[PDB]
Design a protein around this ligand. Structure first.
Ligand SMILES: O=C1NCCN1C[C@H](O)Cn1c2ccc(F)cc2c2cc(F)ccc21
Length: 490
């Protein structure tokens, strides 16, 4: 008997490698794809324009793909626990499918939905295609606790099956054939909203730096895996000035929203390795494996993104310093390297991993001694590839709050920028107020003589702030403080 299925998009915003959507379609007489938009989400949230644009463009891409099959995405407004009982009744739903969510809050949401579906006679299929592995299997093999060091994680997955291959494509014919009739007034209720409807400024015609959606994700995957990009990205990567700019082959926002399947990426990367080198090392997959590591650590920890009550996080007496945090968040620290990175993050929504090391170091154990929790919140607002697991996980790792086995140094907020871009043009691009400084002073403009500041038409302390701390004194004190925190544990 043919099901009436609803496939629920949350992440996994794609039609390729979507085993949950396969389960919705197989043996269905009727299928509807829904995204549930909580109309009061923003009331509790301060998420910025770049993440909203990326989400909306991802939903518009799904709707465009569904229109090719004479169907539509249903953007249902409400909270899942409220709308699903109505949808079940009104649409006569017999099956609900969705990609598994490992994050503690989503797991609790989904468990409640599964209870309500069971009560209503609705079958539920979930598939764990957001990650490479069954995270619960990793934890099970580790004595029912997540690994807390990366080598242990690698040992565990090294005695597990390989990640599942990407699922086969849903039949275009099957999907158009089993579609729900779209009403002409679909957009009364179920349309994808425009950015201007969310109060954001009017969008231009030019493309975003990071255009959302599955179509863009797959085009980027293709370019990313061109042989001509193999040396630059996998054989001999270099952290140079050009690396700091958003790359047209970058995949991380698409992986985070599920516009790109991590299993597809994994096996296409393996395929390219085979062609070029004629069994790859684990390091080939490091980007995906570190992501999986943080997902595994997060899934059973509802306090993962907090310090207090987080069982894996050392309790550190961070300063309560809202003025410093606000300066850090707005790029007003007076360190042009830090400020340019935070400006790029706010303007575009992606910054290089080593630039994330730099600004997170400055906020937490390197300089300002503000809790990593506040850095998590700012990255959640602004960073396209941040989610509960990788954001908090990376901040705890970087700040030596969790996963600690050895100390590693924070980069210098002057020297690291100077080395990465000796030209200073990264600074000039994101902090044009500083553009007249010669490259000798542009990373440390408080050291420029008054003659140079006058000719650069930027007087430090007036047109651009003085550095908010003395880095040499502050970082040595902070190192001393952290060392004592850890050595005292004995
Ligand atoms: O470089 C290394 N070594 C081990 C892992 N890794 C890559 C990091 O995960 C990159 N990264 C993030 C990715 C997503 C996100 F939402 C937040 C962060 C983030 C926060 C930090 F404070 C510092 C690094 C950060």
């Amino acid at each position: 008997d043919g099901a009436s299925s609803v496939h629920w998009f949350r992440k996994g915003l794609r039609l390729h490698d979507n085993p949950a959507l396969l389960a919705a379609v197989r043996g269905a007489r009727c299928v509807r794809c829904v995204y549930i938009l909580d109309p009061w989400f923003a009331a509790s949230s301060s998420v910025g324009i770049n993440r909203w644009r990326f989400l909306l463009q991802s939903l518009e891409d799904l709707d465009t793909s569904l229109r090719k099959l004479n169907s539509r995405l249903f953007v249902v407004r409400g909270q899942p626990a409220d709308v699903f009982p109505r949808l079940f009744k009104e649409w006569g739903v017999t099956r609900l499918t969705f990609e598994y969510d490992s994050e503690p809050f989503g797991k609790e949401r989904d468990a409640a939905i599964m209870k309500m579906a069971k009560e209503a006679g609705v079958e539920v299929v979930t598939e764990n295609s957001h990650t490479l592995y069954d995270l619960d299997r990793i934890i099970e093999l580790n004595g029912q606790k997540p690994p807390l060091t990366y080598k242990r994680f690698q040992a565990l997955i090294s005695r597990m099956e390989l990640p599942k291959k990407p699922a086969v494509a849903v039949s275009s014919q099957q999907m158009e054939s089993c579609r729900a009739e779209i009403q002409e007034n679909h957009d009364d209720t179920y349309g994808v909203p425009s950015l201007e409807e969310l109060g954001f400024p009017t969008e231009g015609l030019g493309p975003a730096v990071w255009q959302g959606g599955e179509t863009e994700a797959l085009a980027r995957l293709d370019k990313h895996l061109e042989r001509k990009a193999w040396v630059a990205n996998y054989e001999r990567p270099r952290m140079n000035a050009n690396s700091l700019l958003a790359s047209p082959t970058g995949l991380s926002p698409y992986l985070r929203f599920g516009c790109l399947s991590c299993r597809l990426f994994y096996y296409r990367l393996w395929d390219l390795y085979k062609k070029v080198k004629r069994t790859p090392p684990l390091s080939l997959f490091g980007q995906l494996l570190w992501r999986e590591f943080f997902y595994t650590a997060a899934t059973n920890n509802p306090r993962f993104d907090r310090m207090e009550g987080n069982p894996i996080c050392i309790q550190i007496p961070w300063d309560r310093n809202p003025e410093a945090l606000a300066k850090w968040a707005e790029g007003k620290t007076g360190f042009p390297w830090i400020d340019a990175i935070m400006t790029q993050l706010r303007q575009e929504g992606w910054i290089h991993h080593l630039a994330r090391h730099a600004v997170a170091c400055f906020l937490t154990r390197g300089d300002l001694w503000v809790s990593w929790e506040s850095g998590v919140r700012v990255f959640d607002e602004l960073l396209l590839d941040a989610d509960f697991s990788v954001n908090a996980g990376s901040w705890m790792w970087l700040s030596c709050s969790a996963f600690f086995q050895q100390f590693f140094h924070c980069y210098c907020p002057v020297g690291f920028g100077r080395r990465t871009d000796p030209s200073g043009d990264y600074i000039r691009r994101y902090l044009p107020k500083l553009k007249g400084f010669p490259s000798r002073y542009i990373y440390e403009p408080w050291n420029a003589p008054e003659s140079v500041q006058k000719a650069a038409k930027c007087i430090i302390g007036v047109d651009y702030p003085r550095p908010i701390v003395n880095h040499a004194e502050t970082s040595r004190l902070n190192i001393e403080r952290m060392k004592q925190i850890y050595q005292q544990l004995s």
